Every structure is written in structure tokens, then in C-alpha cells.
Symmetry: C3
Subunit: 401 residues, 3 copies
């Protein structure tokens, strides 16, 4: 309701003027975080144009296996086709538009629409349509495809018919990710939450640890030009065949780095030790730490020697964002034997809840018409500024006539 109150008296969003006068050292003016007009632009120009992380490919290990997701108002279905390729389609029947797959996941022989049973093969092709006449050309009524790439076991999609370059990022990232053998994972746990903040607020909060000391007791135990200590850490990883070195995109979109953990910590556990005894991938040394990877606007990620976590950021409304956290473990690791579910997840479930509380409290103060932009900490918040620059530049380029 704060959102509605705030809406009423807001000055016009005059987006070009706001972008023109924006200073990189400062939080965004209110309508970036609260307005429906900027939200529609963020959808149209960011989420509907960039590559987005969807799910781990291991969720689609089986024959005829499918999983569905919403991206803004798009309903997407991702399916393992007959020929073993993974493909993605718009989950909308070409007859009258019905969703075809209604469950979050399943297995099918064919994609059969529940309304009137137009039946499609798993590559999208319409192979039967009831009583449509002889003037019906089934070749014009195949499922609409959705661009898809496999990033070394992690499925990404893009809803534009003209997607940007994914290959540069894929080629940069393979070395770092291939060593995790993600295609041999299974999902041990998924947690989906809604945060009552604009997606930008979720990213700003992710891209600093300025707030961590006070707000993240559990994570702090394990989670901490290149400094001396740090290069030394990259050197042990790389000496052992485990790529680790800081890579930052030219345009700031993604970043990869294998960072050391605090103290004697090996993993994101309350005791600091490995959560899973049967490791996912061949990372060495054991204290190689965490491979941080972000790709804007959809995902941040921690790949550890024993297990991995992917984080998917999706917009729900101007002041709501769905965060999906997926724990990946070796496909033959056994719950109750090789890992304990509580021990595996408790750290990040608590961290996520603490972040959500912070983001939500932040959003509420921002909705005040008295909110003005404020200065980011150069020492503590340069990753926030780095995110906000990427956003603003993406938006300016999409708005260019």
C-alpha cells in the first residue's frame, strides 16, 4: 500500500532527464526503485532483452523431462527433446493460447495441450490438430521457440528474437565452471522467496558486504590491481589446474573470481567443514574457496569444492523480486549419508532471510517522498556503483533512437 501512496504524488518519471543528471557516486532517484513506469522499462529493455539464468540442466536429465518458469509475463517451458538436446518454448498453445504444461516439472512423451489436444513433438513441431480442415498448415503453428544456451551445466535463456552476444561470456567462464562437472549434479534443495524490494535493491544489497558484519552472523564465519594475499590464493588454485583469476567483463555485465574463505573454512556450513563428503567436480586444492560469478541482471553464484549454489533473480512487480536459491550436489551424493540437508542449507537460508529483511526495510524508507539519493561508500560500495552503472548504461542504450 506504501507503493500505491507513493505513486499518487510522485513527479513525472521523465526518464531521459533523470538518466542525464545521474551521478555514479549516488543511489538512484526514487522512481527507479518504486515506479511502474521504470519497472515496465526494466522489463521491456533489460529482462526481455538480456540472457537470463533459468535452471540447472540436471533438472532435465531424463527423457521427455520439462520444467516451466515465468519471466515477467512470459511463461516458458524448457524440455529435453527426443534427440537429447535441451530446448525452450513459449508455453502457449498456437490454437487459442492455453498454457500446455501446468506443473512446475514433469515428463511427457509429447506436449499435448489440455484444452483441445493439439499435440506437439518435443522440438516444437505441431504433429496433430483436431478437425482443422484441409486449409490448415501445421507448419505455421509450431511452438514459438526461446533462445537457449547451456553454460557448462547451467541453462540460460533470452526472450528477444535478437539476443546479444553470449559466446564471449560462455568462453570466459568455461574454464572456471568446467571443473565443477555441473552436468553430473543433482538438485539437493531449492528455496524460492519473494523479497518486497525492487530487483535493483536486491542486486545492490548483494554487491556489497558493507551490511554483512552486523546482519549475517552465520555467513561471516565462512565468508570473508590484486593484493598480495589474494594473488597468492589464485596462484595455489591455478598451480593445481583450478582457474581462479579475477575476470571482469568489458561492459561490466559479469565477473568471475575464486576467492578464499575465512579462517580454516572449507564451505558454507556452521562448522566450516565440507557439507557434502562426495564432492561435486574436481576442484583443488580443498581450500580453494568459492567461485563467485555474477551475470546481470539474473544471477549470482557460489561454486565451492564440495557443492554449488545458484541464485536466480526475477522481477515480480516494482517492489517485489523472486529469488530462487538452488543447491547442487554430486548426483550420487546421498541425503542422510553423504550430506545432511539441514547442515547443507541452513547457512544460506538464514542469510537470504536476513538479506530479504534488509532489502524490505530499505524499500520502505525509499518509498517516502522525502527519500533522496545518497552517497555510496567508495571503499565498501564500489561493486554497488559498478552494478548501477551497468544498469543505467543498459537502459540508456535501449532508449537510444
Amino acid at each position: 500500500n506504501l507503493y500505491f501512496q507513493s505513486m499518487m504524488t510522485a513527479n513525472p518519471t521523465s526518464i531521459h532527464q533523470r538518466l542525464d543528471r545521474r551521478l555514479s557516486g549516488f543511489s538512484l532517484e526514487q522512481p527507479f526503485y518504486t515506479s511502474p513506469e521504470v519497472y515496465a522499462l526494466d522489463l521491456q529493455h533489460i529482462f526481455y532483452k538480456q540472457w537470463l539464468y533459468a535452471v540447472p540442466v540436471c533438472q532435465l536429465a531424463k527423457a521427455g523431462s520439462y520444467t516451466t518458469l515465468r519471466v515477467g509475463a512470459y511463461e516458458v517451458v524448457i524440455v529435453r527433446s527426443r534427440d537429447g538436446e535441451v530446448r525452450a518454448f513459449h508455453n502457449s498453445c498456437r490454437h487459442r493460447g492455453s498454457l500446455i504444461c501446468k506443473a512446475r516439472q514433469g515428463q511427457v512423451a509429447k506436449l499435448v495441450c489440455p484444452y483441445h489436444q493439439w499435440t506437439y513433438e518435443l522440438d516444437g513441431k505441431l504433429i496433430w490438430a483436431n478437425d482443422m480442415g484441409p486449409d490448415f498448415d501445421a507448419s505455421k503453428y509450431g511452438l514459438k521457440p526461446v533462445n537457449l544456451r547451456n553454460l557448462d551445466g547451467l541453462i540460460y535463456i533470452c526472450l528477444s528474437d535478437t539476443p546479444p552476444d553470449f559466446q564471449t561470456f560462455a568462453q570466459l567462464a568455461r574454464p572456471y565452471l568446467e571443473v565443477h562437472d555441473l552436468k553430473d549434479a543433482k538438485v539437493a534443495f531449492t528455496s524460492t522467496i519473494i523479497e518486497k524490494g525492487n530487483w535493483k535493491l536486491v542486486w545492490e544489497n548483494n554487491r556489497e558486504c558493507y551490511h554483512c558484519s552486523s546482519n549475517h552472523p552465520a555467513l561471516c564465519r565462512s565468508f570473508p590491481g590484486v593484493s598480495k594475499k589474494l594473488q597468492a590464493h589464485f596462484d595455489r588454485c591455478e598451480a593445481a589446474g583450478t582457474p581462479a583469476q579475477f575476470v571482469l567483463a568489458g561492459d561490466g555485465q559479469y565477473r568471475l573470481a575464486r576467492m578464499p574463505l575465512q579462517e580454516k573454512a572449507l564451505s558454507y556450513t556452521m562448522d566450516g567443514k565440507a557439507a557434502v563428503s562426495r564432492h561435486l567436480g574436481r576442484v583443488a586444492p580443498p581450500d580453494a574457496g568459492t567461485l563467485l560469478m555474477f551475470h546481470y541482471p539474473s544471477t549470482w553464484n557460489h561454486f565451492l569444492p564440495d557443492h554449488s549454489l545458484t541464485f536466480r533473480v526475477m522481477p515480480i512487480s516494482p517492489t517485489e523480486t523472486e529469488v530462487t536459491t538452488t543447491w547442487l550436489v554430486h548426483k550420487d551424493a546421498v541425503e542422510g549419508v553423504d550430506y545432511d540437508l539441514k547442515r547443507l542449507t541452513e547457512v544460506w537460508i538464514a542469510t537470504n532471510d536476513e538479506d530479504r529483511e534488509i532489502v524490505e526495510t530499505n524499500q520502505q524508507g525509499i518509498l517516502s517522498p522525502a527519500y533522496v539519493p545518497g552517497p555510496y561508500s567508495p571503499g565498501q560500495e564500489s561493486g554497488v556503483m559498478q552494478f548501477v552503472d551497468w544498469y543505467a548504461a543498459s537502459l540508456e542504450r535501449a532508449l537510444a533512437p
Copy 2:
């Protein structure tokens, strides 16, 4: 929320251009089913201008008896006046605007506003107003009336001050309906549900049985130029004094036809036999089947030899529609003796729930910005096309300067 997501990035509704390029062989472009702009037009120009089925007149059998309903944002009260006429008024007090009748139904001597007790007679006339002065003319402050017609026991209303012609339809329909003696009915059961689809989607789904084979196991047992078999069926009805022949409005608004049922079925029951042993009206022969009647935009109807069902379609929002199903039986049929409530209603309660699920699943895929119009089946969906033509033509004529 899908509805909100979808809204953001939608292209302008440019209604004239959409209507201009519309082809009758195809489902509507997205904003017809999802947009608030077309929804307001549908209210203003369709629901607020056409005659609408409201309720069976038997709900108003008693002296001073009233029933209320909402039509979009209109609150209407229908009352049996002192002189035995049924009249309808705007349920808004002429003083400061309060609802007068707050319950769904009741009986009163007078209509007394609960705020300040301005008191009206049952023909709308204000007969007392407290301490209003001598410069108060009560004759200017009678309830505002609502146009009303009685279709042979079924009350219809129209919220325009200039209603279209109802008499043509009334004169066509009397022969078909008079034989059901609807004025001697009682309501044995009413079911009200909300479907999460645009009202148009509810009508398209009603006007085909393309989806029935797969989706309606219960109904299929009883529910199936003029063909040979069919004319033969009309001939037995009409030979016996029971009008049955297909009548379709010039402008496509309504339609009446007494159709045969499957197999040995006499009624909409799980066993195919009559639900009520004491029949409503004098229909013959017993296997005369069902009198189908639709009148756009508000109602479809099945009148059987033993009992009848009316269906009222009312818009709630761009993606919500209230369907009210009323089972009418002879006023002296006794629950537990002449009929069993479960046996009377189970078929259509399940059918309605199956239709609602289908409509809702259809609406969700339509909200995808990838939804495009698709071709209707000429063999299976001509009634859908016939409905969509009536809608588009109604809207084009209202938009004409």
C-alpha cells in the same frame, strides 16, 4: 500478478486499428482478453448498454420481496412492488448515496435507507425525508429506475436510459419458454463462482464442445440447413405442441433450439434419468431433450422437461468473470422426496469447475506477450466465431461517431 506483468510492456490498445485488421477466422489479439482499456469499453458499451439476465422472477414471489445484484460497478435492487409488479432501482439513496438494501435478499414494507431513514415506497417514490426543510421537493428524489423486462419468468434488465429492442427477442422466445411454466418454479440451488478469465473467454469456451470429449466426463453421458436426424427430433417436439426449431437472431445475439440428448438420457444426471419426479412445465415428449438458449452478453440456459438451469455471466475485472448457475424446479417439488440435491446438481457443478479450470489455464497462456491470435476450427468452433463476430460488431457500432 501475471495480469500486472503483462500490462506493463503491452503496446497501445489502438482499438480502431485492431478492429479494422481483425479476421473472423482467428482468436482475439491479446488486449481484448487482458487489457483494462478494453475491459472499460466492454463495460461501457456492452454490459452497460445491452439487456442482461438478472434472476428468475420466482425469487421475488412474495410481497415486498427483493434481491440485489452488482453489474460492474452498478448496485441494483429488484423489488416486488405493492401492486404486484416487479421493478428494479439503483440501490443508491438520493440523499448522500448509501446502499439501501445490504442483504442479497429479503422482504420489506418500505425501502428505508440505513443511514438517515429517508423512506421510499416499493415503486421508488420518496414518501418521507427527515428535516429537509420546506424547500424540499421529494418528487425530484425518487429512486432512479432500472429498465426491466420479464421474459416468461426470467427477469432481464438494462442499465442504459435508451435500451435496445427487447421485444423481438421476447416474442421469438415465448413459445419456447412458456411451456416451462417458469413463473411456477422455485430455486432449488444456486452456485456462484469466479473464473479467472476474461468474460469473452468464458463465452468462447461455452460456445464450443471441441474441448468436451477430454474435459467433461460427467456431462458427455447426457450432453451430445438442418440434418435429417435433427429435424426428426424437432418434428416430435413440435408435433406434440413443444416448440423446438432452431431460431438464430438476425444480428446473432440470441439463439434457441431444443436439442436431443445422448443415448437414452432424459436429463443432466449421472444416471441419465430425470432429476425431479414432479416436472417443471408441460414439455413433451419426455425425451424432448434440452432447450438451449443464449443471449449475449449475459446468459446461456438449458431448459429440460423435468427442471431448468440458467447461467448468468458477469464481469469482475479484465481477467475475472462471475458465473451464477441457478437450478429451477417446480415450486411444489420437495427436496428429499421429489429430488435429491446431490443428484440434481452434481453434473453441472463438476462441469462448471472443469470449464473454469480450462478457461483459467487458457487465460494464463494468453497473458504471455508471445500469445498471437490462432485459427478457430471451422467444424468445431463456428459458434466461437459466431460469438466473436457479435462482440466485435457490437463494439464497432458503439464506437461509431
Copy 3:
């Protein structure tokens, strides 16, 4: 949902033309009570520009004590500063905008933001900010203040940087209020409710007792040029040092009058007797009755010899209004000894619920597109007209170029 339905087909709000043709003898045209456009104007020009009652100052009796409230989309914090002054600030951190105080009330040493711990003194001054560099000037990043006045124990605020004159009203009211010793009160009970009516509807209903006879059985027992009887009542109060005489603002904004109660009643109790045995203030005589005070747009008030009630009116949306009723009693009156909570509150809790029902029923009829303005009763509704004139004039003056 009525609100949404109503919205769709409404004619433009053309506010100037509506104000131009407005007649003082008549209820407002629909969009004043139902539209989001007039709601935003009411926020921007009324609620965000006038002085508003916030809370009793006794809620802030302690060192470091604070209480928070929302006014439209503003989040405000009121704090007892180190030096004993009460001050109000925008509850938004100057760093990235977070709420600082999250609870409704509490005590602090300092105002410490929960996100990153920027720490402020209780006068607003930022005294520590972590790792902001040497180019950080903390003097530019103090909390934004909110104008505040103390009306003889009752805290008022104003969100404009250029508040209107409060002193005239404060100087008129002190004599009437000082005798209640409000600074020595405590809150014995607070009740917060939401009424589903526009705030204007809540005020119109407050400003008449045209509806009371039928709708307020409990209150009627105690609640009833200057008439003879009435001047006689003011004369006993004033003879005894208790100011009582009718004072109405020049511009109609406020009004004060100590009115007599019915019968032998001394207080707002089911039995008519004093609710609290230990009196709040030094009012005499004992049957001095109730000091009525209203100040538009935020508050009406009953100050009795034994206890007092303040009523705070805040807008939530076009058809929702939060009413907060606070019972004040002497700070040393003891619950269970000097008063019984039920006996103290039952009359106004029931009255408020009856008013809310009436306002809600009124709002629903108003949402009908058939609602037209109607005539107010000159004898019974002149206070309603007096309120509506104040509103319209306030709005016209704010809209003046």
C-alpha cells in the same frame, strides 16, 4: 473491487470544472469520493500541506523515547531528544534510504540505521558513518526534519517546508485545553481501525448527528447566535474558570466548544458516570460536559472532566481511511483500581464500529455510476456543509496558479 469497476467507466475528473459548478448545499460528485486522481490531489495539497495531529506527547515521556507513523507515503519518526525537546524526522536513512526505526515505538540512545549503522544523534545530526572517505561531509547528511508543534500536550506535525500558520489556532485553543493537563496523561488504550470509505466520507459522517438516533444506541445515552440553555451551560463553566465558549475559525478549519451531556451524564460510559475516579486535568464543574475540538483534516476530539479521547484521521487509499482513537487518563490512574478498561472504552469502540459500517455502506452506494450529488439537511447537516466548504476552498486555493 467495486472501486476498480467504478474507475473504468468514470468520465474525466476535470477538477476545475467540477469545483466551478459545485454548490455548497450538495454532496460531492463521485470522483471526489472514489477517484485516484482526486485522492492524489488530497494527499499532495491537503495532507502534505496542513498541520496534522500525530500523537499525545505523553507517549514520548521517557528519555530517548520514539514513536513512528505513516502519513500517506511519508514515514515519520518522533523522538524525545537529549535536551528534553520533542522533534520529528523523516524515518529514512540519508545513506541509501532505509527506515531507521522499524517498531511503532521504543527507546534508543542513538538512532542507528539497521542496514549499515550510520548513527544519528536524537536531534538528527549524523555523528558516525562507516568508511565514507575524507570527502564526506556529515553535515550535509543529517536526518530531514519534520515541522512539529506541541498543542498543550498533543503533538502536531506538518510535512510541507512552508507550513501554514499554527499559532492562531494554538493561541485560541490553549485556554480550553490547558485545563486538562494533557502533559500529565497516559494512554490507557488505543484502537486503530480501517474504514472502507474515503476520508471525506469519514468527516462528513463525523460532522452530523443526523444518523445518531438510529445508529448509536450506546452513545445517545450520554451524547446529546447561541441558544439560552447553551449559554447558560457555557456560563457555569466559565464562571468556574473552565473556558467553554464556541469559537469557530475564520477559515472554518477548527472549532472548540464545551457542550453539555444528556441527562445526568458525566462521561462516555454505559452508566453515565465518570469512567475514571482520578481525573485528568482540573475541569469544573463536574458536569461541565465535553470539549469538542476539531481541526481539519486530521482530528476530532472529546475532552471530558475525567478522561479525554483524541481521534486521528489518516488516508490509506481513495476508499480507505485509518481512524486511531486514543483514550487519555491521568498518568497515576491505575487500571483495575481507578478505572476498568471495558467500562472506559466500550462506548466509543461500539460507536466507531457503527460509524465505520455506515461510512462503508455509504461508500458502496457512491461507487455506483448512478450516484449523483444530493441535498444536505440544513437543520441536520450544516456541519457537513461547513466541512465540505473548507475542503473545496482548501483545494481551490492549492490549485491556483
